[PDB]
UniProtKB/Swiss-Prot annotation:
Organism of this sequence: Gallus gallus
Assembly, per entry: Monomer. Homodimer. Associates with F-actin; the association with F-actin is inhibited by tropomyosin.
Superkingdom assignment: Eukaryota
Domain remarks in the Swiss-Prot or TrEMBL record: Consists of a large core fragment in the N-terminal portion and a small headpiece (HP) in the C-terminal portion. The core fragment is necessary for both actin-nucleating and -severing activities, whereas the HP binds F-actin strongly in both the presence and absence of calcium and is necessary in actin-bundling activity. The Gelsolin-like 1 repeat is necessary for the actin-capping activity. The entire core fragment is necessary for the actin-severing activity.
Location within or outside the cell: Cytoplasm, Cytoskeleton; Cell projection, Microvillus; Cell projection, Lamellipodium; Cell projection, Ruffle
Residues engaged in binding a 1,2-diacyl-sn-glycero-3-phospho-(1D-myo-inositol-4,5-bisphosphate): 111-118
Post-translational modification: Phosphorylated on tyrosine residues. The unphosphorylated form increases the initial rate of actin-nucleating activity, whereas the tyrosine-phosphorylated form inhibits actin-nucleating activity, enhances actin-bundling activity and enhances actin-severing activity by reducing high Ca(2+) requirements. The tyrosine-phosphorylated form does not regulate actin-capping activity.
Lineage: Eukaryota, Metazoa, Chordata, Craniata, Vertebrata
Tissues where the protein occurs: Specifically expressed in epithelial cells. Component of brush border microvilli.
Spans of repeat Gelsolin-like: 26-75
UniProt family annotation: Belongs to the villin/gelsolin family.
Protein name: Villin-1
Annotated function: Epithelial cell-specific Ca(2+)-regulated actin-modifying protein that modulates the reorganization of microvillar actin filaments. Plays a role in the actin nucleation, actin filament bundle assembly, actin filament capping and severing. Binds phosphatidylinositol 4,5-bisphosphate (PIP2) and lysophosphatidic acid (LPA); binds LPA with higher affinity than PIP2. Binding to LPA increases its phosphorylation by SRC and inhibits all actin-modifying activities. Binding to PIP2 inhibits actin-capping and -severing activities but enhances actin-bundling activity.
Amino acid sequence: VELSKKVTGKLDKTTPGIQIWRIENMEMVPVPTKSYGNFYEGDCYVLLSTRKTGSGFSYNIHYWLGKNSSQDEQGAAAIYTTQMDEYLGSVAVQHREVQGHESETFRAYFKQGLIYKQGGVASGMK
């Protein structure tokens, strides 16, 4: 929720890799490298890639839209990516992905295998 503060504060600094955000239960969440890879398929996942450069770092915010949530959810994953795009310094970029758009791009950042669990992780009841 509101990536700002617990995210825009220090999305990624001096560290080549990527930090995704799980949109399970229709809500953004900080997905570090401890869970990166196995992300629900029916949801949304913002992936912020950061690389080193001669001037500083190059960020690349992505917005994965595992076609399952609702149109508003698409506005959410995109909003968080829009909050870190400016809070990062405008040096980041914006990318579009989906359940069939993050093919070699998503796996590209993941040189191994991307798993996909079941969305709706806020059930724990039904």
